[PDB]
């Protein structure tokens, strides 16, 4: 009665897919608050997930809850979770909160986190101790592995249709307040030769850590040791059940990071991705956690984490209104998923990170974008993997009260308007055709774009054939034109159809024509999925 | 079922109801709701409030409208309707005094001055305040009070009525004492031996013994004796707890007796009251001061080794709700907001200008923190260690000065406010810091709620374990003493509830929910917090 293929992350042609039930899949995700991982809290999780239209829930499973006393395992939460997820026909990503949760051992059992002699903490260069477990603690590694193995044996036994499609190993590893462990135990490894395997993979000359890496030795050392720790846990679990597994990064600012220890040292930050990929070959991907609000910073993060060797998964993102539009470039980069944080009614907000008020309007900002993708999820996922997709978001953030003042003053207003219109105009090269995406304009005539208030728009395009595209967009205009000069030919829209996929087959609902195609393709907040066919034609 | 009883032991107190400590999460009616037809306008509010006990008058005029012709028809209906709703009652005996006056004494009492005489001023004019030296008045009040207690003895065997208030706000406005010939004959004479013995003073006349306090202390003594005799007579029928409620003088700047209600249990005569009326179980403050400092001072003065704290009347406007927390943290046995019914009356500017669902909800939200643990809290308060705090700045009035202010005076002002909105509690090995009006994430300093509203309750369960619930506040734990090289953490925070006296865990708070203290909004959460120190060397 259970014949479904394991989920798997595939990588080729520099592109990636999360295979679920034997085909590409997109996680249109929701993630709970940090204290929702108990049976009694789930009634405060599912309603939000339904309102959001999410297909996949990310939720912790804590070491402390599965092994409250050493060797006495308790999977009562996982049992209820699996059953309730199945009732609602959603899938799960389990977050293993264990040796590290945001740098710290708070979710390790008391017999772990209160026994430093057995399970040692990072020691600073000055001799003081931080509440961050050292990745050189061999007992810690053994005990985390043992518990993780038991979790994976529970899923092997009790989740044969793979309700759980992926597992996050740890949560935001690293250390705040120091660059590495400086304990005697750590110093002995630091003072010794860099392991051959790393030297070989990075194509460097042999030496000790300080000799090989200079001023980067302390940070690279901590990243290597954490990555090896996480890889060993990962390998042990996959030996039981070979699900995709990943780590999530407490990001450093990519333009102005500050110093390791200010940001979480040793996690998969952009400067140690090479270390993590060398050190942890069994981990499937390294996922950014995004709480930067501004378009330029978010865009840079998506660029850094989308690599031929690294599928893009936005494992955590804020739940305030500005964040919703980042679904569009995430999917346009070939991303496999997107998981806004704090999507439950458990009476907590991490404002000022996320939304100040958690209510139906908060959820609706995400529901409105997920409604663009849900009706085509499998078709999009395949085109993303096997084809050409594009995706953009509105590239100016909302005007501040600062800019609000500097506007009341200003001939200057007119130039500013021109500059904003240009910035709110995006070009995409789709082969024989280009698209121009603009934001915040009427659905008729050609008044320049002025942006949405607040910033919110975006667009998704997939290429179906040389002259045919799937298009859906949000609070935006999409206009097509030839990509190269036509040698005396004219061009037009040949046909725009609005429709849907049913059992993989396109069903046309209506043709957009006349006013609906004279002024580009204009989208509001409501979902429309279009197939657009362009033509060039001779006039003699 | 066992009689309710007020216990006092080890300077602590409990109201025992059904053989265990109980907290009155009270509602009190308006003054004209003591009739069967009005009760339909009382119960819906009580239900919305989540109150467990109703305080309501029973008037001498209604039970004895004609001398010797008793009528308990209201008491019957009340008992039956209270039982239907599974709530308890505190009956307020409105008789010789209600707010200094005899308006609730039967017409055959209050219109017969020669039989039942009034206070006479020094100048010979008469006040509408019955003299405590009227022996007829004492006998008549006592007789009727006895009949009421007989009704409860015969008709309330399960003690729906758990306590009785004897009179309401006794004393006299407009004069310090009775200066009638009858009163002068007693005043111009020896202080009674018993009072001299209990205060350890030298024998003499009132004037000799007490000097410039004589007049006021005389009035307080004679009213206390009156109230004790009524009390004793009633308890001899049915030995319920019985108390008196005080029209407070301002504790910082009282003015003169007569301006405030002279002779009641004001803070300067609590020694007289305790000496003269040993059968009265407690003296309860009636609080209509809105401001934190005065309210706090009142709670301090009335919480004594010899006096259980019962807030027998408090305003029903929004600022008053948060005073439940310090009341319970002092080991108070109850709290009773006034005017909780829909009988088309507001005592604004004392209470709320508007009575509506929002008015009630400000109290419902704090009662919802206590109801789920009421019996457990009550036992901890008596037998153990509890604490409770309220947000210590009132709502900003001040906004003129904040407007005219340098961006140096302002940053100074926000720092001063942050410090004032930070409270420290010494819980033994561990301290708690309580702050008000800040996000649930990071450490931006407190700026207070608007309006002021927050508070916290803590009970100690063990050396390192506390029961915690709070409201629009952050609670953070730290070691109370330097740890000598050890570190510390929260070991475990559990949200849960008591079922059959047993703790049931619903979820564990961790991660974001414990990284930045324990953050509470308007919604109820009951936590068990276990702290640990641990070696790193
Ligand atoms: C991301 C992190 O993974 C998550 O558990 C939570 O701590 C949030 C903040 O609310 C982020 O730090
Ligand atoms: C307190 C008093 O006991 C009560 O009956 C009522 O008169 C109020 C005012 O509305 C307070 O004086
Ligand atoms: Na092209
Ligand atoms: Na449609
Ligand atoms: Na008590
Ligand atoms: Na202490
Ligand atoms: Na101390
Ligand atoms: Na609860």
* HEC profile of A123-144: ECCCCCEEEEECCCCHHHHHHH
Check B523 against A347: CB less than 8 A apart: yes
Helices (H) and strands (E) in chain A, counts: 17, 23
What's the gap in Å between B327 CA and the centre of ligand 5? 10
Last residue of a domain, one of B345, B372, B399: B372
Element containing residue B493 per DSSP (H, E) = strand B487-499
Computed from CA positions of residues A23, A24, A28, A30, in that sequence, does the dihedral angle turn out positive or negative?
positive
B511 touches chain A (CB under 8 A): yes
Element containing residue B533 per DSSP (H, E) = strand B527-534
A385 lies in the same domain as A310: no
Calpha distance A348→A31 (Å, rounded): 13
A126 touches chain B (CB under 8 A): no
Q: Are A509 and A448 spatial neighbours (Cβ–Cβ below 8 Å)? A: no
Written as six digits, the tokens of A293 are: 């609000």
Ligand 1 atom index nearest CA of A289: 1
Structural domain count of chain A: 2
Computed from CA positions of residues B250, B252, B255, B261, in that sequence, does the dihedral angle turn out positive or negative?
positive
CB contacts, 8 Å: A64 with chain B: 508, 510
Check B510 against A347: CB less than 8 A apart: no
Check B507 against A350: CB less than 8 A apart: no
Last residue of a domain, one of A344, A375, A406: A375
Quote the domain boundaries for residue A487.
376-540
A199 lies in the same domain as A254: yes
Query: Which residues neighbour A400 within 8 Å (Cβ) at sequence distance 6 or greater?
Result: none
**What does the buried/exposed string (b/e) look like for B450-472 if buried means 16 or more CB atoms within 10 Å of the residue's CB?**
eebbbbbbbbbbeebebbbbbbb
B164 lies in the same domain as B249: yes
Residue B15: HSE in the Cβ half-sphere, 13 Å Cα cutoff: 31
Residue spans of beta strands (DSSP E) within B369-486: 386-390, 422-426, 430-435, 455-462, 465-471, 473-479
Query: What are the φ and ψ backbone dihedral angles of A380, each rounded to 5 degrees?
Result: -55, -50
Q: Is B350 exposed, middle or buried (0-12, 13-18, 19+ CB in 10 A)?
A: middle
Q: Are A165 and A20 spatial neighbours (Cβ–Cβ below 8 Å)? A: yes
Q: Are B145 and B230 spatial neighbours (Cβ–Cβ below 8 Å)? A: yes
- CA distance to A172, A237, A386, per residue, from B266 (Å): 61, 73, 86
Q: Give one DSSP letter per residue of B260-313, joined into a string.
A: B-BTS--GGGHHHHHHH-TT--EEEEEE---SHHHHHHHHHHH-BTTB--EEEE
Written as six digits, the tokens of A143 are: 């005990």
Q: What angle do CA B191, B194, B199 make, to 5 degrees?
A: 85
A315 lies in the same domain as A460: no
Calpha distance A453→A415 (Å, rounded): 20
CATH number, domain containing residue B268:
3.20.20.80
Ligand 1-lining residues (CB < 6 angstroms) = A 34, 102, 171-172, 248, 289, 316, 341, 350, 353; B 511-512
B239 lies in the same domain as B382: no
Q: Is B50 exposed, middle or buried (0-12, 13-18, 19+ CB in 10 A)?
A: middle
- How is chain B split among helix, strand and coil, in percent rounded to 5? 35, 30, 35
Calpha distance A207→A214 (Å, rounded): 11
Q: Is A473 exposed, middle or buried (0-12, 13-18, 19+ CB in 10 A)?
A: buried
Choose the residue to mutate in A289, A290, A323 for probing ligand 1, maximizing ligand atoms within 8 Å of C-beta: A289
B340 lies in the same domain as B380: no
Written as six digits, the tokens of A133 are: 């477990």
B71 lies in the same domain as B147: yes
Q: SS3 of A175, please? A: strand
A162 lies in the same domain as A50: yes
Q: Are A323 and A340 spatial neighbours (Cβ–Cβ below 8 Å)? A: yes
Query: Which residues neighbour A155 within 8 Å (Cβ) at sequence distance 6 or greater?
Result: A78, A164, A241, A243
B417 lies in the same domain as B276: no
Check A347 against B521: CB less than 8 A apart: yes
Q: Which of A142, A133, A89 is nearest to A115 (CA)?
A: A133
B331 lies in the same domain as B377: no
Calpha distance A323→A313 (Å, rounded): 15
Written as six digits, the tokens of A364 are: 């609706």
Which experiment gave this structure? X-ray
Q: Are B454 and B391 spatial neighbours (Cβ–Cβ below 8 Å)? A: yes
B388 lies in the same domain as B277: no
- CA distance to B250, B258, B297, B318, per residue, from B285 (Å): 11, 18, 11, 19
Ion ligand 5 neighbours (CB, 5 A) are B 13, 331, 381-382
* DSSP bridge partners of B371: none
- CA distance to A295, A306, A325, A423, B30, per residue, from A300 (Å): 9, 10, 15, 17, 66
Residue spans of beta strands (DSSP E) within A104-244: 121-123, 129-133, 164-171
Q: Is A44 exposed, middle or buried (0-12, 13-18, 19+ CB in 10 A)?
A: middle
Q: SS3 of A300, please? A: helix
Written as six digits, the tokens of B48 are: 């919305």
* Residue in this structure with the two tokens 């999507």, named with its chain if needed: A343
The β-bridge relationship of strands A505-512 and A521-523 is unpaired
Q: SS3 of A332, please? A: helix
The β-bridge relationship of strands A56-62 and B161-168 is unpaired
The β-bridge relationship of strands B53-59 and B24-28 is parallel
Query: What are the φ and ψ backbone dihedral angles of B418, each rounded to 5 degrees?
Result: -60, -45
Last residue of a domain, one of A358, A375, A392: A375
Calpha distance A385→A379 (Å, rounded): 10
Calpha distance B332→A447 (Å, rounded): 70
CATH number, domain containing residue A424:
2.60.220.20
The β-bridge relationship of strands A468-474 and A458-465 is antiparallel
Calpha distance A233→A286 (Å, rounded): 15
Q: Are B282 and B163 spatial neighbours (Cβ–Cβ below 8 Å)? A: no
B248 lies in the same domain as B336: yes
A131 touches chain B (CB under 8 A): yes
């Amino acid at each position: 009665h259970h014949a479904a293929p394991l989920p798997e992350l595939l990588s080729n042609n520099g592109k990636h897919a999360l295979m679920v039930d034997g085909a590409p899949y997109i996680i249109l995700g929701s993630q709970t608050n940090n204290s929702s991982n108990y049976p009694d809290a789930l009634k405060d999780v599912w309603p939000s997930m339904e309102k959001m239209g999410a297909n996949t829930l990310s939720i912790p499973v804590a070491w402390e809850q599965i092994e409250p006393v050493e060797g006495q395992f308790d999977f009562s939460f996982v049992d209820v979770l699996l059953k309730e997820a199945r009732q609602r026909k959603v899938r799960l990503v389990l977050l293993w909160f264990a040796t590290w949760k945001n740098n710290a051992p708070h979710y390790a059992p008391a017999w772990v986190k209160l026994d430093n002699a057995r399970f040692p903490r990072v020691v600073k260069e000055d001799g003081d101790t931080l509440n961050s477990l050292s990745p050189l603690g061999q007992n810690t590694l053994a005990a985390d592995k043992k518990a993780f193995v038991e979790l994976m044996k529970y899923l092997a036994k009790r989740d044969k249709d793979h309700t759980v499609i992926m597992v996050q190993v740890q949560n935001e590893v690293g250390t705040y307040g120091a660059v590495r462990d400086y304990s005697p135990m750590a110093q002995a490894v630091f003072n010794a030769a860099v392991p051959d395997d790393l030297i070989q993979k990075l194509q460097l000359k042999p030496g000790t850590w300080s000799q090989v890496f200079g001023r980067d030795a302390d940070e690279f050392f901590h990243a290597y040791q954490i990555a090896r720790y996480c890889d060993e846990v990962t390998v042990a679990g996959k030996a039981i059940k070979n699900l995709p597994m990943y780590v999530n990064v407490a990001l450093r600012n990519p333009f102005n990071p500050g110093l390791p220890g200010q940001y979480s040292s040793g996690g998969g930050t952009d400067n140690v991705l090479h270390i993590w990929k060398a050190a942890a070959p069994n981990i499937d991907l390294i996922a950014p956690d995004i709480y930067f609000r501004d378009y330029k910073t978010v865009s840079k993060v998506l660029e850094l984490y989308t690599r031929p060797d690294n599928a893009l998964f936005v494992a955590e993102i804020g739940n305030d209104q500005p964040f919703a539009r980042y679904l569009f470039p995430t999917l346009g980069k070939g991303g496999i998923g997107f998981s806004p944080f704090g999507m439950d009614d458990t009476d907590y907000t991490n404002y000022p990170l996320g939304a100040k008020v958690y209510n139906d309007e908060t959820i609706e900002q995400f529901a409105q974008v997920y409604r663009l993708v849900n009706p085509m999820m499998r078709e999009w996922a395949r085109l993303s993997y096997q084809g050409q997709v594009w995706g953009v978001a509105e590239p100016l953030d909302s005007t501040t009260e600062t800019q609000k003042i500097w506007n009341a003053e200003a001939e200057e207003k007119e130039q500013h308007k021109k500059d904003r219109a240009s910035a709110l105009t995006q070009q995409l090269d789709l082969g024989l055709w280009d698209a121009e995406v603009t934001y915040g304009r009427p659905m008729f005539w050609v008044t320049p774009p002025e942006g949405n208030t607040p910033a919110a728009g975006g667009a998704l395009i997939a290429q179906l054939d040389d002259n045919e595209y799937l298009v859906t967009a949000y609070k935006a205009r999409v206009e097509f034109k030839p990509s190269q000069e036509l040698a005396g030919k004219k061009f037009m829209i040949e046909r725009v159809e609005e429709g849907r996929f049913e059992k993989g087959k396109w069903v046309m609902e209506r043709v957009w024509n006349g006013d609906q195609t004279d002024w580009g393709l204009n989208f509001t907040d409501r979902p429309h999925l279009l197939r657009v066919k362009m033509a060039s034609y001779s006039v003699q």
